[PDB]
User: Fold this.
Amino acid sequence: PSEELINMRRYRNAARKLIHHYSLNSTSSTEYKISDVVMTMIFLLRSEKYHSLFKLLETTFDDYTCRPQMTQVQTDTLLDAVRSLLEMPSTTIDLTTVDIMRSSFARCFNSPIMRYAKIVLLQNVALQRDKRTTLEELLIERGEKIQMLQPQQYINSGTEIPFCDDAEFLNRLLKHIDPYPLSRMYYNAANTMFYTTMENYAVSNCKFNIEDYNNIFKVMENIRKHSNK
Amino acid sequence: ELINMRRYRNAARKLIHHYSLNSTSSTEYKISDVVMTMIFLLRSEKYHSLFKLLETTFDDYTCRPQMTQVQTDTLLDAVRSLLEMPSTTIDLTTVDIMRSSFARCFNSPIMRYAKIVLLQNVALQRDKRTTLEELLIERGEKIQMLQ
Amino acid sequence: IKQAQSLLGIPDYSQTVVDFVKMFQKIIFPYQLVPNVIIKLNNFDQMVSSAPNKAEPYKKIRLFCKNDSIAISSSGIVPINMPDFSPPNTFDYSDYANRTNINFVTQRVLTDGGFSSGITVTPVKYNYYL
Amino acid sequence: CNKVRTVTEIVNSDEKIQKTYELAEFDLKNLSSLESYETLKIKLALSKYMAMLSTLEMTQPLLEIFRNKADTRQIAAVVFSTLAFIHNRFHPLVTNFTNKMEFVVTETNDTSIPGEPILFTENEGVLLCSVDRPSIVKMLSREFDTEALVNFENDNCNVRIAKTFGADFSITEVEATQYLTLLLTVEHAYLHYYIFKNYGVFEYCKSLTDHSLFTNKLRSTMSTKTSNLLLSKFKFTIEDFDK
Amino acid sequence: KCNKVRTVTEIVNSDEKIQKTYELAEFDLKNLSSLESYETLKIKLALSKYMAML
Assistant:
């Protein structure tokens, strides 16, 4: 009968939803209530566990994007409890994801802004450097060591091609495949690749992710032009 | 604990003060302080009485039952106690206006992350149209099928 | 059973199970422990087993032989006629089996192997006897 | 306005009758069947490729392979097969190439590269390729995935309301869907690979400084056959670049 | 001096003809590569000779 008498299940599901969004960047959703952010925080604070994370998360409120200090052992227990409470299958959820989320929260309250916000703050400050370099230097630096590195395998590389011909089998496959609205289902996959395109770096990250990535899709219209001579 | 209850009360007080004398929104104020406010409520038994109702109205529009005069008076007591100022008397009903504010406030959007756009006509008659000849070639299929 | 024989040399696909049974029996007392074979028996019956019907491995076998001062459980040596493990114990004190040490040793392991995935670790535990 | 008109008259002008119609809804049925069978063709191609992969002794689910890092064998095999399939779809001619090629799995972030998980060194005496297993796994972090969604539409009464009125190894779909990821990735890589294989390292500086311009070189270059780019919208808000 | 070198070819009896174009920028670059490798080798050789003689 205390105020804690709550849909803890609802609050859990919504906390997990929020984390799943902002951290894993999982998939399209409509995660557009400031309201239940509070429900999430209180769901945290109904334990000194997870409040342990909140100890760090509080530092958002001073809003300066200072690079967080590590106390190594406790940060390790932090990572532990993080993945645990997230109940994820230990998908290598690491310090980089952690600080990404930290910066997410260090971007949220930043808004005193209640009007609808079209603001995809793709950027992150905390890239362990004073300021962003170009990519060209890395095009030097990785290429060099790559040329230093030596092949991990041989290919026999003679004439080989595989094929199969069990037409009935293949049709059985087709039928099993039939239901899926792949049309829908794969756009999110493409978005996955997109996310990965910038997740690739927390390291002087590319600014011009935008318009050449868009040009890739313009290549479809280029294909239509090639069809139309 | 960690909780700087000093600042928590100071912030809560200033925030609610400006908000409630507007009877309404607090444009200057960073959203964090909403969270700090509810923290204060949860950690202050004196104000759980009304935190209860705020909780109820964290979902849309809900309208609240009768309160006996004991409750009304303790409510206004805690209000003036948080807002101890000579400025004005307090009225029971303005909480309703503050409610109508809070509802929209918390209902507000939060953010976006970028989302692709997908479905449309890929093409139309503005592309090469099929012609008899290739269909002749194809229907040669049946002249091969025979049987 | 068919599969097990298959993995084994199959001089006689027709050989009676009890053959294998007693062959394994030959070693019980000298090794004082339960064959995995016999455990899978009384595991993969519907009912007289761990009983997938209800998932009741709680039906551990307490197994005794003539003149013994002790018996062989599904889970190690036990003193006679007692409920498999006293809650009071020389407990697996958490200084051992601390998450922290487990993880540290596991990282050592992973590095040394050069292995990306598929590794898990667990402490041993003990019953009446250690 | 396409309000096609029709008149018929008997011999000796004894009688004349008129009617009128519109190509509307005829065009709709055409477009319907068109996209229908083309989507079917793409689905069939996907099934074909996946089936082909099925021969390759999948002792493990696909993801397990990359979750392991001890191997390089299986990985390079799969990759080479993918490239073979792509080239075959560009060229109705099953074939083999310079019969020496080889691979490396890059394994450190500090050996990774922005954007592209794959790269070719065209002739270091001979062709060689390098690939980011770490990033591959990051794409494999498919906890991302969920189907339950809703397509955008427009102008349905004209456009879509018409469309309203029509209708062991037995593995599930989501993984298969994921296949498309590496499909499209290897496509994007193949583009640059083909390009520089045919052309200068200057236009392999370019194409990598940005992809962008290579549309020009693709002009007169494309096989007159489309690839894997049906649904014509692929974009976000843009003006919000807010420099 | 971008010199998009320009070229055409003809069937004898001039039925019809084809055009192509090309760019030195790869060739000059490879020339420079060869040059620098060459001279580097020469210098290294010279140094080696000196050292051995001593």
Q: What stands out?
A: Chain D touches chain A through 85 residues (CB under 8 Å). Chain D has eight helices and five strands.
